[PDB]
Amino acid sequence: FMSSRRQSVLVKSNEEGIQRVLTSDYAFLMESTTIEFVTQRNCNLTQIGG
Amino acid sequence: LIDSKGYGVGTPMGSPYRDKITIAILQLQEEGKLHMMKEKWWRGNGCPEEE
Numbered sequence A: 001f002m003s004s005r006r007q008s009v010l011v012k013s014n015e016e017g018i019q020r021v022l023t024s025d026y027a028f029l030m031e032s033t034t035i036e037f038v039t040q041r042n043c044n045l046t047q048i049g050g
Numbered sequence B: 001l002i003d004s005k006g007y008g009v010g011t012p013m014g015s016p017y018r019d020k021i022t023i024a025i026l027q028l029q030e031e032g033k034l035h036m037m038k039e040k041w042w043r044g045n046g047c048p049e050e051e
């Protein structure tokens, strides 16, 4: 997917990617420690998978 | 969509007028001649979707 949608879904910052889930269908792979931040300051963004 | 294609202006390899047409295709998004000519040629019938 990342080759086929290069520069299409690829964000270059975390909070713009936080915004990009907040806009549309977006999954935003990062590490869980920053996921532990954004989830615990927003009751709208949870963590599928562990 | 399925991919992210685009069409390009065909020029010979090492075109003499490459930048004469390169920044010329850069300037057609400025006033939007790509966009102000987009509403005409793609919309031959204003198809009334209701369903």
Ligand SMILES: *[C@@H]1O[C@H](CO)[C@@H](O)[C@H](O)[C@H]1NC(C)=O
Pocket: A022, A042, A043, A044, A045
């Ligand atoms: C997502 O965040 C809060 C809940 O944490 C919600 O009230 C807010 O409206 C949502 N943001 C949107 C829909 O843009």
